Ligand binder design. Structure first.
Ligand SMILES: *[C@@H](O)[C@@H]1CCC(=O)NCCCCC[C@@H](CCCCC)OC(=O)N[C@@H](CC(C)C)C(=O)N1
Length: 162
């Protein structure tokens, strides 16, 4: 639904995602360095928790009070089909279907990633992206379980919270 896509926000060299009015997640390596604020808020008002290329910001005030809070999980069960909510600069919404594999630690191009590997689903997709969220549906509810970190055997990795 559109409220889910309204959570996907351009951030640094990629994207991030509003889990709730106060919680923003992204991939560490797209985060700007040497800034005094994020989204106009001083660093002194933001609780930053990051590890394994997963970054979480918790703001002191409601930044996106238009949003309900949704569930953030540490990866998903092996075999889950996730959608990676990729946005283009136009605002075009391009969900990418991925079959999720195992959670592991990996060194990718110098950075330790705590992530879950997956494979792009050729059969479920039409015949600057780091930070995009990996989501899947539980009932009519959406769950977020990672952020796009790496891709190359049509393989992807999302960083996950630990
Ligand atoms: C967002 O910043 C990118 C998204 C992936 C991407 O752009 N892939 C195209 C370049 C491929 C470079 C090789 C891959 C190998 C990953 C293998 C595991 C599937 O490297 C990355 O994807 N590196 C990654 C940055 C590191 C620091 C995690 C990256 O480009 N992420």
């Amino acid at each position: 639904p559109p409220t889910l896509w309204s959570r996907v926000t351009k951030f640094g060299s990629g994207w991030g995602f509003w889990v709730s009015p106060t919680v923003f997640i992204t991939t560490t390596h797209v985060v700007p360095t040497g800034v005094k604020e994020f989204f106009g808020e001083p660093l002194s008002s933001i609780a930053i928790h990051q590890a394994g290329e997963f970054t979480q910001f918790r703001f002191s005030k409601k930044m996106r009070p238009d949003l309900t809070g949704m569930v953030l999980e540490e990866g998903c069960p092996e075999g889950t089909v996730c959608s990676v909510l990729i946005k283009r600069d136009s605002g075009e919404l391009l969900p990418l279907a991925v079959r999720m594999g195992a959670i592991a630690s990996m060194r990718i191009q110098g950075r330790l990633v705590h992530g879950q590997s997956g494979m792009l689903l050729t059969g479920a997709n039409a015949k600057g992206d780091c930070g995009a969220p990996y989501v899947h549906k539980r009932g009519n509810d959406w769950v977020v379980c990672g952020v796009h970190a790496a891709a190359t055997g049509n393989t992807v990795v999302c960083a996950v919270q630990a």
